[PDB]
Structure formats: structure tokens, C-alpha cells
Design an enzyme around this catalytic site. Structure first.
Site, PDB file in Angstrom:
ATOM      1  N   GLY A 127     -19.425 -51.092 -11.945  1.00  0.00           N
ATOM      2  CA  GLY A 127     -20.106 -49.885 -12.396  1.00  0.00           C
ATOM      3  C   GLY A 127     -19.258 -48.625 -12.404  1.00  0.00           C
ATOM      4  O   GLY A 127     -19.812 -47.525 -12.253  1.00  0.00           O
TER       5      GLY A 127
ATOM      6  N   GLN B  53     -10.803 -46.985 -14.358  1.00  0.00           N
ATOM      7  CA  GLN B  53     -10.102 -47.752 -13.320  1.00  0.00           C
ATOM      8  C   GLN B  53      -8.614 -47.945 -13.578  1.00  0.00           C
ATOM      9  O   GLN B  53      -7.893 -48.354 -12.648  1.00  0.00           O
ATOM     10  CB  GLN B  53     -10.722 -49.149 -13.187  1.00  0.00           C
ATOM     11  CG  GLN B  53     -12.020 -49.194 -12.439  1.00  0.00           C
ATOM     12  CD  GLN B  53     -12.594 -50.615 -12.401  1.00  0.00           C
ATOM     13  OE1 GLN B  53     -12.992 -51.174 -13.427  1.00  0.00           O
ATOM     14  NE2 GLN B  53     -12.610 -51.202 -11.226  1.00  0.00           N
TER      15      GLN B  53
ATOM     16  N   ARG C  63     -15.463 -49.893 -17.248  1.00  0.00           N
ATOM     17  CA  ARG C  63     -16.122 -49.862 -18.563  1.00  0.00           C
ATOM     18  C   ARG C  63     -17.302 -48.885 -18.579  1.00  0.00           C
ATOM     19  O   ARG C  63     -17.509 -48.161 -19.569  1.00  0.00           O
ATOM     20  CB  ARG C  63     -16.593 -51.276 -18.946  1.00  0.00           C
ATOM     21  CG  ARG C  63     -15.458 -52.281 -19.078  1.00  0.00           C
ATOM     22  CD  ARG C  63     -15.980 -53.689 -19.270  1.00  0.00           C
ATOM     23  NE  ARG C  63     -14.931 -54.646 -18.953  1.00  0.00           N
ATOM     24  CZ  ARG C  63     -15.098 -55.965 -18.963  1.00  0.00           C
ATOM     25  NH1 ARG C  63     -16.278 -56.471 -19.274  1.00  0.00           N
ATOM     26  NH2 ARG C  63     -14.088 -56.770 -18.634  1.00  0.00           N
ATOM     27  N   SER C  64     -18.105 -48.867 -17.505  1.00  0.00           N
ATOM     28  CA  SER C  64     -19.269 -47.964 -17.439  1.00  0.00           C
ATOM     29  C   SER C  64     -18.830 -46.510 -17.540  1.00  0.00           C
ATOM     30  O   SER C  64     -19.509 -45.680 -18.181  1.00  0.00           O
ATOM     31  CB  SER C  64     -20.040 -48.187 -16.135  1.00  0.00           C
ATOM     32  OG  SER C  64     -20.722 -49.456 -16.072  1.00  0.00           O
TER      33      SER C  64
ATOM     34  N   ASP D 201     -11.415 -60.192 -21.504  1.00  0.00           N
ATOM     35  CA  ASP D 201     -11.288 -60.487 -20.074  1.00  0.00           C
ATOM     36  C   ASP D 201     -10.196 -59.637 -19.418  1.00  0.00           C
ATOM     37  O   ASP D 201     -10.347 -59.216 -18.262  1.00  0.00           O
ATOM     38  CB  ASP D 201     -10.951 -61.976 -19.850  1.00  0.00           C
ATOM     39  CG  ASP D 201     -12.179 -62.887 -19.672  1.00  0.00           C
ATOM     40  OD1 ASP D 201     -13.349 -62.499 -19.883  1.00  0.00           O
ATOM     41  OD2 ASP D 201     -11.944 -64.074 -19.301  1.00  0.00           O
TER      42      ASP D 201
ATOM     43  N   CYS E 147     -21.407 -52.490 -15.423  1.00  0.00           N
ATOM     44  CA  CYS E 147     -20.455 -53.558 -15.713  1.00  0.00           C
ATOM     45  C   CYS E 147     -20.396 -54.403 -14.436  1.00  0.00           C
ATOM     46  O   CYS E 147     -21.455 -54.687 -13.866  1.00  0.00           O
ATOM     47  CB  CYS E 147     -19.123 -52.974 -16.187  1.00  0.00           C
ATOM     48  SG  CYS E 147     -18.442 -51.573 -15.135  1.00  0.00           S
TER      49      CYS E 147
END
Ligand code: JOD
Length: 282
Positions: free
Chosen positions: A218, A262, A221-222, A181, A215
Site C-alpha cells: 500500500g 518505493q 504502486r498505490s 512483476d 497493492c
């Protein structure tokens, strides 16, 4: 510089935030006018994450062709990806329309439906074989065929039917279920194992349309998924694998969608994944 020793040099000097801010400063800025039209407000999950006009995926519809999704086309690596946000209650039909129209084989999901006690995307696929889903706005039917649950990820076989033509296609759903998380994984081993399972299925190969990867927004993680995949492919193709520059590859990908990677922690994790992955390939 090479990658593994550039890596240790940033760790010892504790400068990941400065490296990441440089990337943010140099990244492309292109218009996203269609995303910001008033009629598309309930088609965007986040007001600050939008597809560029020049690379956005268009739906084959004359009323409204807009979806929050971007085509990332990597010329030297000869790989393409569609990066998109997690579907919203009012865009699940658009999502499967895109999968159909772009001839994708696989969907890669990197989030859970609920994280941090809040909804991160709609429940957009069926959970029981005998309870199929019909999307009336785009005239598609979606059926769960089989499900294989493993410790770090789940793979599902799905049938997508175009109800206008009665054509059917098999779609593979690759769901990475264990990203924490908060933060990033401590080891890249399970993420790399997952990447290799997607590769082995054919879903990334040129005989199919581009894989769809998402994700929640987007981009985070993507972005990590496609950045690691492309860097590893380039290391296999080139005479000199130490010439692959992960920062330059990331800036190339940011020509096609804003905000990829990010946080500085996601940047460090991407380096770790490519470094460990290059040892296993050989
Ligand atoms: O045209 C492409 O294809 C891929 C990217 N690129 C140039 C710059 C960065 C790359 O990763 C390698 C060379």
C-alpha cells in the site's frame, strides 16, 4: 523548474537515485505506536510498513480498532484517499468493515493475488455470482454482481450488505491486472486510461467517502496512483500549471503515510504519467 524539462535534465544527468534519496531524507517521521502493539502483529503484512497514529483509519469497534490503512487528505486539490495494504487472511473482514464505515464507493487494486510465485494478498472478493462470501467476524455479506474483463484491467460490480441492519450498497472494484512483476510499465498510457476510468465512475468524487486503494504494501504502486491523480487535478485548477511541483506534492502526501513511491524507477514513472496525462487533458 517545470516538469518536462526537469525530467529530461535528470535523464541526461542520470541522477534519479540522488533525487529519490533526497525525498527519503526530507520525508516526515511521525509515531506509529498502535501498529507496533503486540496484539496487532498478525494485522500487518510487513514489519517496516505501518500507518502513522495521527492519520490511521479506526475501525468502529471497541475491542480492537486497528487496521493498516491511512487517510491521505489533499487540501488544495480537494481529494482524499485511503491507502491500505493488501488484505491478509485474518483481515479480510476488517477490510470490508472499513469500506462500509467510511462510505467508500470504489476499491482500486494494483496487484495480482499471486506475483513472483508468492501470495501478495488474500482472495478477498467472490469470483462467481452464485458463491457469495460471508465475513462472520464483522457481519457482512459480499456478492459478485457483474464482471467486465478488458486487456489491461477488470471492473467488477459488488454488493455489500450489512447483515446487522440489512442495508445494502453497490461497490465498484477497479483491478489493474498488468503491472509487471519487476520494474514499472514502459508506457504510462494504460495506467492513465485506468485512472480516467476510475474518475469517470464517481469513485473519487466528494459525494462519496474516500476511495480505498491498495497493492501489496500500500505504498509503491498505490502512491503512484494518488500522486498522479492529485498532480493532474492541480494542473487543471491553477492559473499556472507549470507551478505544480511533483516532489513537493509527494512530500505532502508522505505526511500521511510513510514510504510512498518505493524506488527511483517508480518516481520516474510518476513524472512520465503526469507529463503525458497533462497533454491529453487538453
Ligand atoms: O495543502 C496542500 O494541498 C495539496 C498540497 N498542499 C500544498 C503543498 C503541496 C500540495 O500538493 C499543494 C500545496
Amino acid at each position: 523548474m517545470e516538469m518536462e524539462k526537469e525530467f529530461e535534465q535528470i535523464d541526461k544527468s542520470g541522477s534519479w537515485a540522488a533525487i529519490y534519496q533526497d525525498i527519503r531524507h526530507e520525508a516526515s517521521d511521525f509515531p506509529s505506536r498502535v501498529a507496533k502493539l503486540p496484539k496487532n502483529k498478525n494485522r500487518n503484512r510487513y514489519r517496516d510498513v505501518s500507518p502513522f497514529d495521527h492519520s490511521r483509519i479506526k475501525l468502529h469497534q471497541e475491542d480492537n480498532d486497528y487496521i493498516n490503512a491511512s487517510l491521505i487528505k489533499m487540501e488544495e486539490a480537494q481529494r482524499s484517499y485511503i491507502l491500505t495494504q493488501g488484505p491478509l487472511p485474518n483481515t479480510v473482514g476488517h477490510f470490508w468493515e472499513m469500506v462500509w464505515e467510511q462510505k467508500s464507493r470504489g476499491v482500486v487494486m494494483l496487484n495480482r493475488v499471486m506475483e513472483k510465485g508468492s501470495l501478495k494478498c488474500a482472495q478477498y472478493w467472490p469470483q462467481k455470482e452464485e458463491k457469495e462470501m460471508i465475513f462472520e467476524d464483522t457481519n457482512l455479506k459480499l456478492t459478485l454482481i457483474s464482471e467486465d474483463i478488458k486487456s489491461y484491467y477488470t471492473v467488477r460490480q459488488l454488493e455489500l450488505e450489512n447483515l446487522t441492519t440489512q442495508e445494502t450498497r453497490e461497490i465498484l472494484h477497479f483491478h489493474y491486472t498488468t503491472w509487471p512483476d519487476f520494474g514499472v510499465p514502459e508506457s504510462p498510457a494504460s495506467f492513465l486510461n485506468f485512472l480516467f476510468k476510475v474518475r469517470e465512475s464517481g469513485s473519487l468524487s466528494p459525494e462519496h467517502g474516500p476511495v480505498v486503494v491498495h497493492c501489496s504494501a500500500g505504498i509503491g504502486r498505490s502512491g503512484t496512483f494518488c500522486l498522479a491523480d492529485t498532480c493532474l487535478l492541480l494542473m487543471d485548477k491553477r492559473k499556472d500549471p507549470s507551478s505544480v511541483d511533483i516532489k513537493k506534492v509527494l512530500l505532502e502526501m508522505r505526511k500521511f503515510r510513510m514510504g510512498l513511491i518505493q524506488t527511483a524507477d517508480q518516481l520516474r514513472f510518476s513524472y512520465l504519467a503526469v507529463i503525458e496525462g497533462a497533454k491529453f487533458i487538453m
